Amino acid sequence: SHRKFSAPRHGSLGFLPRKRSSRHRGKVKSFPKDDPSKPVHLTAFLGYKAGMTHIVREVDRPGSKVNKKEVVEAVTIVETPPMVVVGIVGYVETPRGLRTFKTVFAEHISDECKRRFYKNWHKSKKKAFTKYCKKWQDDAGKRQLDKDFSSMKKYCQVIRVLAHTQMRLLPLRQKKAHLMEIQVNGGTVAEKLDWARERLEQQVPVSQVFGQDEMIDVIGVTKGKGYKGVTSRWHTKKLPRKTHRGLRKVACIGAWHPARVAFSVARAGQKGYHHRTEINKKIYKIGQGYLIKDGKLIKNNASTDYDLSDKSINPLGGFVHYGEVTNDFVMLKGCVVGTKKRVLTLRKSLLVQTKRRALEKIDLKFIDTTSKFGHGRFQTVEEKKAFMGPLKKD
C-alpha cells in the first residue's frame, strides 16, 4: 500500500556510486567551450588548500539590507605557485569522440615532474625522457619535432598544455609534482600552438589565468571518512531507542516484489573521498607571494587599503596542519572540498556570468590573521607584545 505521509527521498541518486575516487587529483571533465575570437588563454590551474579565514568588506547590493554595510565572510586560501609548462598534447575530433593525436614534451623536465613518472623514485635510475630529450639536440630530431607541430596544426582541433606544480616551494612533505593537462582556449589552432610552443619550460602565474572578482569552479576530492552507516552516509531517520538489533539502520530495504534490493536504497559503505565539482566560487583576492626587495622581505599580502599593518596571510602559528603560505594565493569565498594540503583544480566558469552577485566587485576592508590553533585574539605578534608587555622569557 502507499506510504502514509509523503517525504522526499534522502540523498541524490545523481552522485552514485558513493565509492572512493579513482583519482586523487580532481579531473576537469569539461573545459570551457572554445571561442576562436578571444585571445589565447588557459582555462584551469592547480592549487593547494591552505586553510580558511574570514574577511570584512562593505557590500554593494542596491535594495538589500546589507547595502553600504560591512559583513564578515568566510574564505578559503589556496596556495597557487606558478606552474611550469612541459608539454603539448593534441586532440582530433572523431566520430567516436576526441582522440589523443600527438604529445610533445619540452627538452628539459625538472625532477619534480619526473618524480610523477615513478612509483619508487629512490630505487629508480631516473631514466625518464633521457632518450626523448636527445631529439631537441640534433638537427635530424629537430626536423621531426617541427613536423609533429606542423601535423598538429593540420589535424588537431583541441590543444592542451602539460603543466605541473612546483612542490619545492610548498611546505608539504610531498616532492612529487602534480601534472595535468590544461586546455588552451582562444584563437586559431595555429595560434594555440605558437602560444604553447613559446611557453615550454616557462612558468605561468595564477594571475595570468584568473582575475579579481571572477567566478570559478573548484574541482577536487572531498574529505574521506571511511566506512559509514546509513544514518551518517545517507541521513536517514534514527529508529526508536527500543529497536532490537540496532537503530542506526534503514528499517525496510524494499518491498517483497521486486524480489531484490534496489540500487536506490540506502546502504552502508564508503563516505567521503568523492570526486566533486563545485561552481560559482568567487575570487576575493589574488595574493602576491613573498619577495625580497632591496634586502627586505616584502610579505604584507594580507594588508588592505583600510588596514596598513605589515602582515602576511599566514595566521599566528601558521596554517594549522598545513604550514606557511609564502607563494601566490587565491582567496575563494566560502568553502571548498578536500582536506588541508589537498590539491584543488581551479577552472574557469562554463556559464555566462551576468548576475549582480556574479558581477559584484570585492573590496576587502580586513583579513583576520589570528591564530587558528586556538581561540586566537591577536592579529599580529607586534600587536600581542604591545598588549602583554615584557614577559619572563625576555
Binding site: 522526499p8 574570514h54 557590500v59 535594495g63 538589500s64 539590507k65 554595510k69 560591512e70 559583513v71 564578515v72
Partner: protein, 131 residues
Amino acid sequence: SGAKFRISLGLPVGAVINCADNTGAKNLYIISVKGIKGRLNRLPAAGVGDMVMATVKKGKPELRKKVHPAVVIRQRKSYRRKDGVFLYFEDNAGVIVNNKGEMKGSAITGPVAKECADLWPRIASNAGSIA
C-alpha cells in the same frame, strides 16, 4: 523592500515564552508558526521577527483558552548576523498582535531584537530599546 535573512530558529512548537507587553498575558505557548511548510517529523520553529500562533497559559482569564497571533521579539538561542555577530538574549519573549501586525498592548518590557523591529514597525515604535 529589503528582505530579512535566515536566522537560527530557537523556538519549536510547544515553546512557552514570556509575554513582554501589557496585555495581561504572562507567557505565550506556541502552537504553530506562520509561513512554515515543513516536512515529515519536523516541528515548525520560530525566531525573532516571526509571527506565530500562541495561547496564553498564565494571564488574564479573558486572554486564556483562545489562539492569538504573536511575534517573537527576543530569543535565548544565539543567531548570526551578516556582520558576524552572534547575539542572544537572556530570555524568550513575544508580544500579542493581530493579523496586520499591530500590537494588542501598548508597552514592551525589555529590549527588542533589531531583526523583529525592522520587520514590524508597530512593534518597533513601542520598543524601549533595540538590540
